[PDB]
C-alpha cells in the first residue's frame, strides 16, 4: 500500500533539485515570503474496487506558482515549459513507477494576481489490508465407499 | 439481509485460483419444439435437451489462456477444463458453490492493445455437466 | 553422424541460413534483443518450409542459445546470481549472438528382414 | 383515481410466496393467417391460435429456481408450474388477480456476478391456460 | 431498521481508538478547539423503493480534520494515510456489515485555512414498517359441488 | 502490479518498426460443430479448426500501406507478410512478444479524409501461424 | 510532424475543381475464397479480386450532378469519370496525390430540403483503376 | 454566396400550393449488375435502370391526402399526381425548380395523435419521371 | 519540443506590427496604462498521449482590449476585424505551422467596463523526451543446428 | 468412453496415388454396392434376398493446382491402352483411438477433365472411379 506522503516528498525533490526558488506546503508560508515561491498540494482522490482485493485510483496533483516581485510573468511563462520537461509519462515512487495519464494547465488570475497552475493526474491499482487464517496441510483422508 | 454483491465473487480455473477476475456468467439454455394438440388452442412444447454457454472477464496480468490452450490447440487436440466460482457475501444469507465442468474454451486472444486503455480479456466458453455445492 | 547423407543434409542447411545470416544482419544491424527475436523468427520460418518440403521431420525449434550466453556472462565477469532466467536471455552481449536450433532427420532403407513361412 | 403502480404487486409460485420480485410479465400473442378475398381490397385474417410468453425478474437472494427445476432437468423430466400475480394499489380502483398456469421455463442461471453489482435473476417462460380472478 | 446515530457512534468509536486528536460533532465546538479537532457528519441519504416492503439506501459520511496550529499539513497528509487503512470495505454495525462502495478525497482551503475532506459512500437494503393483521387456521371447509 | 497498459505497445510489420501505431489486435475464432449423443442431455461439441483474424489502426502519416500491396495487388499476385507485437509496461509484470505470420490484408485505403479531422486508417487482415517469445 | 489534417483537401472531378467539398473517400475491397489444406488447422484463402468503393459530400451550391448525369441516364447511356484528390498538410511531410477511373455514380438526388437545414449532397460511386502520383 | 437553406422550399401538388411543408426529398436509386471480365481483376457494373423514391412531410392541417386518395383507393382505381419543387434562397446563387412526375403514394394515414404533440404527417411515394426547370 | 515562451513572442510580434496601441503581458502593466492597451496571455493547455512517443496539445490564446478613455467602442469594433485579419488559419512558430482549429470572441463587461476578448485554439502534436543507449553491430552470429 | 472428439475429422486425411502422394485432396470416396436378388419362399410371408455380388464404385476431388490426370492417362487412353492405379488413403485424427489406412486396387477412372473454368470461379477437379480389390493397414 503505497503513502501519498512518499509520493508528496519524491514530487518535493524533483522539484528542489530541478529549481532554486522555495517550495511550499501550507498557505501561511506562502504569505510570508518574499518574492517567487512555489505551492505543492493533492487536490483529489477517487478510490474503486476493481477486484476483491485491489482498489483503482486516480490521484490528482497541483503544482503553483505565485509571482511576488512586478513583471515576473516571463518567468512564469519559462518555468512552465522546465516543469513540462519533468514530467513525461511516469515517475519512480519506492521502487514503483506510476504511469500520467494527462497533463491540464492555466494561468488565471487569483484575488489581484495572475498564477500559473499546473496539474497531471496519477493512476494505478493498490491492494487492500485483509487478514487470513493458517491452516496446516492434509496429513490424514478417511474416505468410506457404502453399498 | 443484503442482495449478493460481485465484488465477493472467486473463481478457480483448471484447480488454479484466478485472482484476477472481474466478472464470471454461466447459463444453461433448454432446447423446445413447438407441439399442436388437436382441440386446443393454446400451443405447447416439448423439453429435447440444453446447451451450456458462459464467459470468464479478466484483467491482462499473465498469459494464462496461452500457457492453458496455444499449443495444444494448433496440433488438433482441444482440452477441456473445470471451474469453481464461490459468491460469499458477509451481508448476504449465505455461501452459493457451484462447479462447471467439461469446459471449452471458443477462441484465443494473443494480443489485444489500444493506447491509453487497460487490458481486459473476455473468453466466452461452451459446458455440458454441473454440480452443486452449498447452495443456498 | 556416422553417415554421410545425415551431416551432408546438416552440412546443407547450415550453410543454406549462413547467406541469409551474413547478407543482411552481419555488420548492419545493431546487436539489441528487438534485432535478435526479428532474426530468430526468420530462422524459424525459414525451418517451417523446409518441415514442408519433407526435408527433415517436424517440430523443430530456434531459440537462445542459453548455456554459450551465460559462459560468455562469466568470461566477461558479469555475475549471474540471483539474476532471472528472462533477465539473462536478454541482457546485453556486446557483438556476439548465440543461438540454438534443434531439427531431425531419417536414413534411408539399407536392411530389410523377411520371413516367410510355408 | 390513480393508475395502478407497479410498487404494490405480489407473485405466488409453485405455492410460495416470492418476497423479492421486481417485475412480472405475461402476454398472448395470437397466429393469424392472411385471406385475400375475391373482390375486397383489404386483406382480413383468421385467427388460429396464441403462444403464451412472460418472464419474471427478481434479486439474486436464495437458490429459488435451482431447487425448482436443476436436479430434474438432468435426467430428462420437466416440471410445470403455477404462478399467481396480484396487483392491488391502494389509491387504485380494485385489486386483480390472475393465475398462470402450464408454466415452463426457457433456461437456469447457474451463476452471473461483476464486481460493484447487485445480482438479479431474469427468467422468461411459457405458459398454456389462465384464470381470471377478481377482474376490475 | 437500522439507526443513523448508531452508525454515527460506530465510526466515533473507531476513530477515538485509532487517533488521540478530539472528534466533535457541532461547528460550535470545533470553533473552541485549540488546535487540531476532527469534524464528523452525515452529508446525504438518498432512499430508493425497490421491492414492496423494503428501500435502498445510499448514505455519504464527511470526516474533516482542521489543523489550527501553523505548520501542520505534513500531519494532514499522514492522517490520510491512517484513514485509508481503518476503513476498506465494510464496516459492522449492530451485528450488519455494510459495503462501501467509493472513497473520495480532497484538499481545498474553507476561508483561509486548507482542510482535508475524507468521504465515502455506504449502500445497504433495510425493511420498512408495517402492521399485518393475524388469522386463525381453517378448520372447517364447506364445498358443495352442484348438478 | 498494474494491469498492462497499451500505452506501451510496438509494432514490427514487414521487418519495419511502425512509429505511429494506435491499437492492434488478433484473435484465433474456434469452428465447432454440434453432436448429439445418446443418452446424454446436455449438447457437446467437436473442435475442427480455427481462423485467425485481426486488425491495425495507424494514423495517416505515410503511404505505408499502398507501397507495400497497391502495384501487386492489380498485377494478380497477393504478398503476405509477418508482425511482431511487444508490450512492455514498466510497472507490470513482465514483456509479452508474439509474431503473426502469414498475413493477407482485406483491402486498401487509397484516399479518407474530412475537413477537420485528423486521418486514420484501420486495416482488417487474416493470418494463419504464430509463435510465442517470452510468454509470461 | 502531425498527422495531415483533412481541412487541406482538394478534388477534381471530370477536369473541374470542386471549390465546395466537405469530404472524400475511396477504398478497394478485396475478394477471398476459404481454402481448407489437408493437414493443416489454420484456415487459408486465396485472392480473386476487388471492388472500388467512394463517396463524395459536397454542399448544395450547384447543380453540378444534374448537369452531370440526368440527361444522359434517361436515355440509357451512362456515363464514366476520372477523379483527383489531393492533400497537402503544411504541417505535414508531403503531398499525396491519387487519380480515381472509371467511376460511376450510384444515385442522383433531384431535391432534399429540410426547413432550418443547409443542404448538403453525398453521392457514392464505384470504380475499377486507379494511379500513383506523389505518394510519400 | 451561402448554401441553399430550406427554409425558402416551395412545394406545389397537384397544381395546388403546399403552404405547410416540412421537409421535401426525392431520389434516383440506379440498378447495377456485377460484370466480371476475363482478364481484369477490378469488378465492373452494368446499367440497368433506376427506381424513383421520396417523401413529404407536413403538419396536420387539413385533410389533403384523405381527400387526394382515400375514396379512390377503396373502389381500386390508383390516382398518379405531379409535383414542382422550388429552392430559392434570397442569399444563394439562383433559384431551383424541378417537377417529378406519375408519382404513387406508399400509404395513407386515417389517425395519428398523441397528448401532448402537435401532429405532423409524412408520405413516402415512387415516381417514374421528372424535367428540370431553372437548374443552377 | 515547441516551447510556449516562443508561441507567445511570435503572436506578440505580430500584434507589435499590425496595432500601434501597447501590449502588456502582466496585469499590473495594464493598470498603469493611460489608454487603450493590450493584454495577452495563454488561458489553457491540454495534453494528451496519442502514441508511445507523442503527445497532442491543445492551446487556447487569449487577447484582450481594454479602452481606457471614454467613447472608445468603435475603436472595439474595428479591432476586432483587424484580428479576424491577422489569424486565418495557421501561425509560423521556429520553422513550424501550426493549424488553427476554431475562433470565439464575446463583448461583456469587466467591473464597471466593457472589454473585447478574442480567443482561438491551436492543436499539434509534439514528441516527448527520451534516453536510448546505444549498441554496437552484430559482427558474430553462432548458430549450432543440433540432432 | 463415448466422446465427442472421438469423431474423426476429415481434415486429417492423406492420399497417395500410383505411389506419389497428393497434397490437394479435398475429399475421397470408395464404397462397395452388394448384387442382390428376390426370392420368395413357398409357406413364408417375407420375402428373401440371395447375395450375388458386387461393385466397387468411388471418387477423387482435388484443388486445380497441376495436370495430374492428364499425365497419367491422356495419351494412353487415345492409343486404346487402359491403365490401372492403386490408391492408399490414410486418416489419422489425433484425439481419435487410431489410423484407417486402406489400400484400394484395380483402379480404373470414368472420364478426363481438359477443361473447366469460369471467371471469378476457383478450379476444381472431379474424377469418379471402380475399382476391384482392396486391402486392410492398421484398422481400429
Known amino acids: 500500500m503505497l503513502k501519498y506522503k512518499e509520493i508528496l516528498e519524491t514530487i518535493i525533490e524533483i522539484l528542489k533539485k530541478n529549481f532554486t526558488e522555495s517550495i511550499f506546503i501550507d498557505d501561511e508560508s506562502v504569505q510570508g515570503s518574499e518574492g517567487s515561491c512555489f505551492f505543492v498540494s493533492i487536490l483529489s482522490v477517487i478510490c474503486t474496487p476493481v477486484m476483491l482485493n485491489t482498489n483503482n485510483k486516480d490521484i490528482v496533483i497541483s503544482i503553483k506558482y505565485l509571482p511576488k516581485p512586478q513583471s515576473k510573468s516571463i518567468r512564469m511563462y519559462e518555468i512552465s515549459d522546465e516543469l513540462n520537461k519533468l514530467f513525461n509519462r511516469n515517475i519512480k515512487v519506492t521502487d514503483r513507477k506510476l504511469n500520467i495519464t494527462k497533463l491540464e494547465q492555466s494561468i488565471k488570475k487569483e484575488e489581484s494576481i495572475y498564477v500559473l497552475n499546473f496539474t497531471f493526474t496519477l493512476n494505478y491499482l493498490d491492494s487492500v489490508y485483509e487478514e487470513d487464517v493458517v491452516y496446516e496441510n492434509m496429513k490424514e483422508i478417511n474416505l468410506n465407499l457404502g453399498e | ?136 | ?118
Not at chain 3, 548492419?28 to 523446409?50: G, H
Open chain 3, 1 to 118: 553422424f556416422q553417415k554421410i547423407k545425415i551431416v551432408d543434409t546438416l552440412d546443407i542447411i547450415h550453410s543454406d541460413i549462413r547467406k541469409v545470416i551474413i547478407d543482411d544482419y552481419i555488420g548492419k544491424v545493431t546487436n539489441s534483443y528487438d534485432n535478435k527475436c526479428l532474426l530468430i523468427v526468420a530462422i524459424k520460418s525459414y525451418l517451417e518450409e523446409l518441415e514442408k518440403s519433407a526435408l527433415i521431420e517436424s517440430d523443430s525449434t530456434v531459440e537462445i542459445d542459453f548455456e554459450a550466453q551465460k559462459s560468455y556472462l562469466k568470461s566477461k565477469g558479469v555475475d549471474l546470481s540471483y539474476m532471472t532466467l528472462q533477465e539473462i536471455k536478454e541482457a546485453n552481449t556486446g557483438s556476439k549472438v548465440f543461438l540454438k536450433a534443434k531439427i531431425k532427420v531419417l536414413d534411408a532403407m539399407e536392411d530389410i528382414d523377411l520371413s516367410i513361412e510355408i
Open chain 2, 1 to 136: 439481509r443484503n442482495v449478493m454483491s460481485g465484488t465477493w465473487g472467486e473463481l478457480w480455473l483448471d484447480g488454479n485460483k484466478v485472482a484476477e477476475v472481474k466478472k464470471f456468467q454461466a447459463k444453461m439454455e433448454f432446447t423446445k419444439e413447438d407441439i399442436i394438440i388437436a382441440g386446443q388452442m393454446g400451443t405447447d412444447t416439448k423439453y429435447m435437451g440444453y446447451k451450456g454457454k458462459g464467459s470468464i472477464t479478466l484483467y491482462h496480468v499473465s498469459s494464462r489462456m496461452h500457457k492453458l490452450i496455444g499449443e495444444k490447440i494448433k496440433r488438433g487436440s482441444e482440452p477441456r477444463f473445470v471451474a469453481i466460482s464461490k459468491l460469499n457475501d458477509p451481508d448476504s444469507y449465505g455461501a452459493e458453490r457451484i462447479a462447471v465442468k467439461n469446459i471449452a474454451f471458443d477462441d484465443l486472444t494473443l494480443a489485444d492493445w489500444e493506447v491509453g486503455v487497460k487490458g481486459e480479456i473476455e473468453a466466452p466458453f461452451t459446458f455440458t455437466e454441473y454440480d452443486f455445492l452449498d447452495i443456498i
